[PDB]
Amino acid sequence: EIVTEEQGTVVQQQPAPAPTALATLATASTGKSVEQEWMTFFSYHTSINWSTVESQGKILYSQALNPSINPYLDHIAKLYSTWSGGIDVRFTVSGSGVFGGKLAALLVPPGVEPIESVSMLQYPHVLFDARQTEPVIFTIPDIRKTLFHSMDETDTTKLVIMVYNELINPYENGVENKTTCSITVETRPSADFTFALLKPPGSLIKHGSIPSDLIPRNSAHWMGNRWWSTISGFSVQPRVFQSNRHFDFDSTTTGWSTPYYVPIEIKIQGKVGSNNKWFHVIDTDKALVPGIPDGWPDTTIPDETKATNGNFSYGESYRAGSTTIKPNENSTHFKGTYICGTLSTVEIPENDEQQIKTEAEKKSQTMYVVTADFKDTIVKPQHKISPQKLVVYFDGPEKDLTMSATLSPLGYTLVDEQPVGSVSSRVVRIATLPEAFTQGGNYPIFYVNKIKVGYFDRATTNCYNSQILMTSQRLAEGNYNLPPDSLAVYRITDSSSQWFDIGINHDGFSYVGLSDLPNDLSFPLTSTFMGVQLARVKLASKVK
């Protein structure tokens, strides 16, 4: 016997009413009419502020065709794996009848990235005046070279709206008297829009999905990559770099820790006649790399020093004013290490010879972890990590003890006026060090955290990060698609009326269209995915 997809004998149940009755009762109270109701109404998309300052050429809107534009389509598309068809877009302009000015509408073919310039108007285009009343509906046709689209495709037709003729106001007093009118954009799926093949519930996607959730909605959720503190600033460098918790669009990592902040479980060795301060780490419980423990800080001491017992000691030229800083003043032998509380617990042999148990009865102490070279007399900085260069510093034991501990990064032994990991030479590599250079008009950036120091009341220093923590987790555990020649763009909007575009390249680093972002930024920031653009295209921004 063969059972088809709907095959089966239907049996009637005794306690069952007449469907038609209840059916209409529903339709009646509910008002149900059509099925894909979203086909019968325009849904908000975005809005445009056309001011009298924007001159001829300025692009005020550039959207590419894609089911994502419509919240409804976007949701349904999740069940399917194919799409095709266009999407209608409605612009509703509302300016004074006294105004003057005209916008231009272009339809750019697929496979060609439009540039912002008047020369764009040397292409067939439609105009609509500022005093336009009834909304205009432009249909973005699905010009494609394939039989249908894949959920991962993004190179489609594009509708661009640009300033044709400057906005004018007869009452315009001058330049410092900007005037502006709004334009609201809405979408409605076109008659020929269609989702195609359904995909089995648990199946996986052979070609990753579009990266639209790599940067959380509110900066309130922007934890760091290096440190766990909440991001509170940016840094536009001509060259960004990092290797630990940094993750690739291919879900690969040159690091030794996962995209999470978990406690560190090491094991310290202590023999007699050895060192009584700096210790070597042996084995580990939780680790991604066979030897190096998950989470182990990716930084090393600035200069070489001897394994001498010491404590905090910063010159007077520090937190007593706004003076400068001299690398000589700070003489904290364990400068540069990462401060992290712990839970100590030494082992006891069946024949406790020395006063071991005496140590096992001692209160655990905060260690000062780090990665460096150790020859029992000197501690030299080594950025090439290995299951050997793992050293901790504190009071420690003396006899032949095998003390195991559980660390938890909390602070950092201050060193200079410069942020943590701002120097390549000091960043713990491991084989290779990922990096992202300036690309024409896009400069890479570092996400600035705030790590705690260890002597100055409750002060802290700035810590650099290669990517928001969520960005790392998603690139890690996810499967995203992005053509190397391009980058996933996001709109960062300030708590005021300031904003700038951030683009993530295939490697995993974020870029910006500026060579330096402003300091004054009401940080309760917000983000919104824009789409995928080319790297050789300067990113947008309305700062200053």
Nearer to its own copies, 21 or 431 (CB): 21
432 binds its own copies (CB under 8 A): no
Q: What's 231-256 look like in SS3?
A: CCEEEECCEEECCCCCCCCCCCCCCC
Nearer to its own copies, 169 or 382 (CB): 169
Structure tokens at 473: 């987790």
Residues 52-91 that bind its own copies (CB under 8 A): 70-72, 75-76, 78-79, 81-82, 84-86, 88, 90
Task: Find the shortest distance in angstroms from Cβ 314 to its own copies.
Answer: 9
119 binds its own copies (CB under 8 A): yes
Nearer to its own copies, 189 or 382 (CB): 189
Task: Find the shortest distance in angstroms from Cβ 501 to its own copies.
Answer: 18
> Residue 516, SS3?
coil
Q: Which residue has the tokens 């094991």?
A: 267
Nearer to its own copies, 292 or 468 (CB): 292
Residues 145-164 that bind its own copies (CB under 8 A): 145-152
HSE toward the beta carbon, residue 213, CA cutoff 13 A: 9
Which of 34, 134, 324, 328 contacts its own copies by CB under 8 A? 134
> Residue 417, SS3?
coil
Q: Which residue has the tokens 């509110």?
A: 218
Nearer to its own copies, 70 or 472 (CB): 70
Q: Give Cα separations from 106 to 166, 174, 189 (angstroms).
A: 17, 31, 19
Q: Give the x-and-dash track for 201-220 against its own copies (CB under 8 A).
A: xxxxxxx-------------
Residues 346-405 that bind its own copies (CB under 8 A): 346-348, 360-366, 368, 394-395, 404
Nearer to its own copies, 87 or 382 (CB): 87
CA 158/CA 155 separation, integer angstroms: 9
With a CB cutoff of 8 Å and minimum separation 6, the contacts of 330 are: 313, 314, 315, 318, 414, 415
Residues 496-525 that bind its own copies (CB under 8 A): none
- Residue 419's Cβ-count burial label (10 Å; 0-12, 13-18, 19+) is buried
Which of 49, 218, 276, 313 contacts its own copies by CB under 8 A? 313
CB-CB contact of 141 with 86 (8 Å) = yes
Residues 229-248 that bind its own copies (CB under 8 A): 238-239
User: Minimal CA–CA distance to 140: which of 210, 69, 197?
Assistant: 69
Task: Find the shortest distance in angstroms from Cβ 542 to its own copies.
Answer: 19
Q: Give the x-and-dash track for 271-310 against its own copies (CB under 8 A).
A: -----------------xxx--------------------
Residues 450-469 that bind its own copies (CB under 8 A): 452-458
10 binds its own copies (CB under 8 A): yes
1 binds its own copies (CB under 8 A): yes
Outline where DSSP puts E strands in 428-539. 435-437, 443-448, 451-452, 460-461, 464-465, 486-493, 499-505, 510-512, 526-534
Task: Find the shortest distance in angstroms from Cβ 541 to its own copies.
Answer: 20
CA 372/CA 375 separation, integer angstroms: 10
Nearer to its own copies, 35 or 353 (CB): 35
Nearer to its own copies, 96 or 386 (CB): 96
Tell me, rounded to whole angstroms, the distance of Cα 341 from its chain centroid.
Answer: 29
Q: Which residue has the tokens 């990665």?
A: 371
Which of 98, 217, 386, 523 contacts its own copies by CB under 8 A? 98
Residues 28-47 that bind its own copies (CB under 8 A): 28-32, 35-38, 40-44, 47
97 binds its own copies (CB under 8 A): yes
Which of 57, 141, 302, 478 contacts its own copies by CB under 8 A? 141
CB-CB contact of 475 with 214 (8 Å) = yes
